[PDB]
């Protein structure tokens, strides 16, 4: 049974950027409703409800034929934005091994700030803009709906333990941005966690 | 190149349904940039740059391997949007030979319409559902973000002759129904241009 969690900050904490009114609907029907459904398709499956959230959309394969696209979007839906409303904070600062890693990887924070702007900018439909962590490597990555690169690159075209990202479906920037995604994107680095995105650097599980 | 057309109709045109200010953002920012996106991969395709979009979208395979998508995407858009404007008037009413082959093939209007919710409902991420003609029969079937049934089962999961379609698009219902495409989906039922759907079933392609 999967319990909706609760923001760790108030609607309104990501203000000027992040517009409370869409952190309030977001989170209590959007998330609430992947809550709702991956619940209901688990139900006749108890032996998967168990397993964290995290967990279960790495063994989709697993499932019953009938219950994979189901808890593919769903509980992909769950895990995604539970990760997100974490990832997200206002006054921090990029540095430590992150930091390091990043201007490793992609040669300065400015080159990967590029190359993730371009992942979340041209995924077309709804999806998620990822950094990720391919084993040693630091990666910018994109998937489409709720698919997470957790799931592999089978299934979701992407694959690395995700340190952060960003939801690009429509309805986590209509109301505020409506069709200006771009600016959206630019708001988010003002927002993005780099304290829980480090601390995932470190663990890297 | 291509252009984006004018509305059959003023901004407000479909109210109380369909909001004015989605109407104007829908068709001047999200259409018109389909539009510019195709146009900007086509300008270097002069031998598939004079064709009409709905012919362009039925031969993707034979672009070269790096425009595919992209045109997929915007090229679509623009055949897609360009219908769906023209599918939608207020004030029609479903009759004819239209309505004796919905009732036909789906047993009744209200049988046709309770599938058609479930498609437009059911289509996860961004979409459309579309009522088509194959083989002679009227069926109902979604496909994912700009994709047509017109470009072939292979590329877009379906296929036939689209007699009228409903954007689900987060952008196409976010503004005023949110979360809530049910809803819109409900609305839609008053804005479906049964006249233009009509001609399209009379002439069958
Ligand atoms: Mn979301
Ligand atoms: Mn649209």
Chains 1, 2 share one sequence.
Do not use: C
């Not at 034929?65 to 990832?87: E, I, P, Q, Y």
């Amino acid at each position: 049974s999967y319990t909706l969690p609760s923001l760790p900050y108030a609607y309104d904490a990501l203000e000027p950027h992040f517009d409370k009114q869409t952190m309030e609907i977001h989170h209590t029907k959007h998330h609430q409703t992947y809550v709702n459904n991956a619940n209901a398709a688990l139900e006749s499956l108890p032996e998967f409800a168990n397993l964290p959230v995290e967990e279960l959309i790495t063994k989709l394969d697993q499932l019953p034929a009938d219950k994979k696209t189901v808890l593919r979007n769903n509980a992909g839906g769950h895990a995604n934005h539970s990760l997100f409303w974490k990832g997200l904070k206002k006054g921090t600062t990029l540095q430590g091994d992150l930091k390091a890693a990043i201007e490793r990887d992609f040669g300065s924070v400015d080159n990967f700030k590029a190359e993730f702007e371009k992942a979340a900018a041209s995924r077309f439909g709804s999806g998620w803009a990822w950094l990720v962590l391919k084993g040693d490597k630091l990666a910018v990555v994109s998937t489409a709906n709720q698919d997470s690169p957790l799931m592999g690159e089978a299934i979701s075209g992407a694959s690395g333990f995700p340190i952060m990202g960003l939801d690009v479906w429509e309805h986590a920037y209509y109301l505020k941005f409506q069709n200006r995604r771009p600016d959206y994107i630019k708001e988010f680095w003002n927002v993005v966690n780099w304290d829980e995105a480090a601390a995932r650097f470190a663990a890297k599980k």
